[PDB]
Subunit: 219 residues, 2 copies
């Protein structure tokens, strides 16, 4: 009995961690996440305006009489930045489409899921608890009543308590699992982001290893 309100409490602490700790944190990450995107979109703009202006300076040098080659270099620096940005707004779109639209689209759908799960558990615990402790009393009083049929009632109670041990034990494991599944999903989505961004790193590094060589002006 004492050990069982323990399971009950421990299982409840987990559903409550999910509902009022984890779930809200996902709304938050969608909030902070959207701010993150807007900063990204602002950086890419400031870059495009900056390099568009380098392109113009470059276009002037192309027109000149001795700075044609320097002219070519500046124009292809802006072109490069334009490319790296195309590459980067891919990672930014993975972040948006694959991660940020996912959480806001499902966050309440999964709140309600765990809410029903938690309710199902509580309600079944209450019943077993009730049907059990009442059977104990039947046994408890057809006990002093020196009833012969107290033996079928002793086994009816003992199996009822075994089933509750099973259920309570299984619920705690299933609730732990759900918690882990949600951490794992957060970790996995961020692993995909880390991976796309790693890919961008290799591409950008790819073109800069040669650009830096082509833009030297001698030796």
């Amino acid at each position: 009995a004492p050990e069982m309100d323990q399971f009950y409490r421990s299982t409840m602490a987990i559903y409550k961690s999910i509902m009022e700790q984890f779930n809200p944190a996902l709304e938050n990450l969608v909030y902070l996440g959207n701010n993150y995107l807007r900063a990204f979109h602002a950086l890419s703009e400031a870059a495009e305006v900056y390099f568009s202006a380098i392109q113009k300076i470059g276009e002037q040098a192309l027109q000149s009489s001795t700075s044609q080659i320097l002219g070519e270099i500046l124009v292809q620096m802006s072109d490069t930045q334009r490319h790296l940005n195309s590459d980067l707004e891919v990672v930014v779109q993975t972040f948006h489409g694959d991660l940020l639209q996912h959480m806001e689209k499902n966050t309440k759908l999964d709140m309600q899921f765990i809410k029903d799960s938690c309710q199902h558990y509580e309600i079944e615990y209450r019943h077993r608890a009730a049907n059990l402790e009442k059977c104990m009393s039947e046994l408890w009083r057809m006990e002093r009543k020196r009833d012969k049929n107290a033996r079928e009632m002793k086994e009816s109670v003992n199996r009822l308590h075994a089933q509750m041990q099973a259920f309570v034990s299984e619920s705690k494991r299933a609730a732990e699992l759900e918690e882990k599944r949600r951490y794992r999903f957060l970790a996995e989505k961020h692993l995909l982001l880390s991976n796309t961004f790693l890919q961008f790193l290799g591409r950008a590094r790819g073109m800069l290893q040669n650009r830096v060589l082509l833009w030297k002006e001698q030796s």
Copy 2:
């Protein structure tokens, strides 16, 4: 002779362009430079806040019964973003310090230099043009007086006209050299920025590709 005039107007057109076109383009470039810097430090701040939250979640998983490994990963993911941001803000300060600040002064000290080079050329052109007229005048006078020595005056005028052709060619090649030095500065600075950013791309790849393999196996 007015083809020497056409040299004169081009040699001035070059100095005046550096001063009236190029340098106000660089001042604009400094502004867009700092706007760019501004959007980066904001992205940094957004990303920083976002992954500070990711890490909190990791710290909550670190205190669960079965999600400690996933929680360690999430925290390792924040620590990684933080390291990368730190490493990149370093490249960004190269931008501000090695480029933007240096342009600032160049676009200030330069205007005085170009003013002094225009004036200097104007003074030297006119002194040579005046002395040429003065010798042509002395020639035509001898030619009136039937002076036998106009033979050694026309010879001199020829020498002077020649030295004037040389001065007019040199001064223009010197103007074109000045205009090109300034494009060269723009290009050298951004090549340096490019190499600094390339070194970072390597460091970022190196650190991230290792983490991603681990995270993949652990989750």
